[PDB]
Each structure stands twice: as structure tokens, then as C-alpha cells.
Amino acid sequence: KTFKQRRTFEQRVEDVRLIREQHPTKIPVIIERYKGEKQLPVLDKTKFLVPDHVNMSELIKIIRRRLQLNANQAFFLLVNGHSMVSVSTPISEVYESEKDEDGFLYMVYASQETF
Numbered sequence: 001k002t003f004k005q006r007r008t009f010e011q012r013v014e015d016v017r018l019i020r021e022q023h024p025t026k027i028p029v030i031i032e033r034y035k036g037e038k039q040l041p042v043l044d045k046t047k048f049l050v051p052d053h054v055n056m057s058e059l060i061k062i063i064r065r066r067l068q069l070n071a072n073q074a075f076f077l078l079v080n081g082h083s084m085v086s087v088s089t090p091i092s093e094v095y096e097s098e099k100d101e102d103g104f105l106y107m108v109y110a111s112q113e114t115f
């Protein structure tokens with residue numbers, strides 16, 4: 001059902017290696033709905049190439065636009081299983097500290113801070 005479940009560690013690693021070869025300025029991001037989530041829709045896809053210069057505040061804006069949310073729908077984004085200490089950090093920096101061992105950066109969204 002989830003991404004890690006669909007693809008072998010081997011497959012996720014080789015894919016990250018190809019994105020490096022072909023999309024060298026992009027951060028390979030996995031963005032998934034919380035398995036409890038009722039209110040927000042599922043994304044049209046799972047794997048995203050995020051320009052390495054955008055900060056987390058702008059990545060939240062991007063996903064809210066992708067979900068076609070309105071002003072007073074709530075949106076919370078976990079990175080590597082936990083809260084973001086800051087939304088102002090560039091995603092290149094966030095990748096280097098919060099990346100998975102397979103080389104993706106893993107995010108999960110919900111309408112409550114209680115995931």
C-alpha cells in the first residue's frame with residue numbers, strides 16, 4: 001500500500017541514483033497521506049522532484065495548491081516521521097539531515113497535528 005512497501009530498498013536506491021543522473025538539481029521527495037486521514041484528498045502521485053532552493057514554507061504552499069485546498073482547511077507536514085523545526089530552511093539543507101538511507105526524503109500530511 002505505502003511506497004516503501006511497493007518497492008524494494010534496492011529499487012528505491014537505484015531510482016534515487018537515476019534522478020541524480022537526470023534531475024541533478026531536484027530533491028527526490030515521497031509525499032503520502034496519513035493512513036488515519038479522513039478530510040484531505042490523496043495526491044495524483046507519490047514521487048516529486050522539488051527544486052533544491054525552495055524552503056519548506058513554499059513546499060507547503062505548493063502541496064496546498066496541488067490538493068486545491070482553501071484558506072481554512074488545516075495542513076500539517078511531517079518530514080522523516082517528525083515535525084519540522086523550521087519552514088524557512090532550504091530543502092537542500094533539510095534533505096542532507098532528514099533523508100532516508102534509501103535516499104528519498106519522506107513526508108506525510110494530515111488535517112490534525114495529532115498524526
Ligand SMILES: Cc1csc(CNC(=O)C2CCC2)n1
Nearest residue numbers: 026047048049050051054062
Ligand atoms: C517544485 C515542485 C513540486 S512538485 C513539482 C513537479 N514534480 C515533478 O515530478 C518534476 C517535474 C519537474 C519536477 N515541482
Ligand SMILES: [Cl-]
Nearest residue numbers: 023024025026
Ligand atoms: Cl535538474
